[PDB]
Design a protein around this ligand. Structure first.
Ligand SMILES: [Cl-]
Ligand SMILES: [Cl-]
Ligand SMILES: [Zn+2]
Ligand SMILES: [Zn+2]
Lengths: 49, 49, 49, 49, 49, 49
């Protein structure tokens, strides 16, 4: 599960893009949620600060 | 500021690489510190949660 | 621009995250808009086909 | 269905690099071609505008 | 194969960040190593110039 | 210089896409060449192992 590491890298970019200036909180956590099936941008707005 | 937005993208990848499994909190306060001047990996490690 | 070439790299990534399977058209003109001032994800969905 | 999404993220960067000033067209479909099997940079030029 | 190819992309970004101005070296021998099991920042320092 | 640092990140991505499995030696001289002026795909192949 370098697979997990790789997914996590993309997830933080996606979080960055969705959340913008409010920023976000990153925990794996989230990755466990979003690396099995794709999380929508709508779903990602949920992890913004 | 398109420039900070671009820099922020690199900054969140760097934070992800350093913090890894610990995860982290991303805020404007880190962007202002590390996208005005370059932060070492040692410094970013201080923002890992 | 040196700036536009790098900015374009980030822009195509944002377009991909936003448009997903719908896909998109990248045209150098999308860059003239979104690399001078920041385009929101909402704005970018407009370039999804 | 994350492996494909992760791959698609890299493919658009490759397209960006190969096509340059020409721009390119991105489609589900191009990803199934180039994320099932590795496409050479030569192959990718086919997707440039 | 595509996964290894993709993983290598993340590996060189990690090496760039870890090595900084020293620069770095990699081979498809090192990519195989750090993409089968995850390499620490410490292990990655081994590939700096 | 933060812009040199950021450009360098994109350059390694490009070098990797071009060199793939062959690998490369990444040094200051290459960032000075390809981050002051844009390097073509042919120019990048010059740095592959
Ligand atoms: Cl940049
Ligand atoms: Cl990946
Ligand atoms: Zn990836
Ligand atoms: Zn950049």
């Amino acid at each position: 599960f370098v697979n997990q590491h790789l997914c996590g890298s993309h997830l933080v970019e996606a979080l960055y893009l969705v959340c913008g200036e409010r920023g976000f909180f990153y925990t794996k956590g989230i990755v466990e949620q979003c690396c099995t099936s794709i999380c929508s941008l709508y779903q990602l707005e949920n992890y913004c600060n």
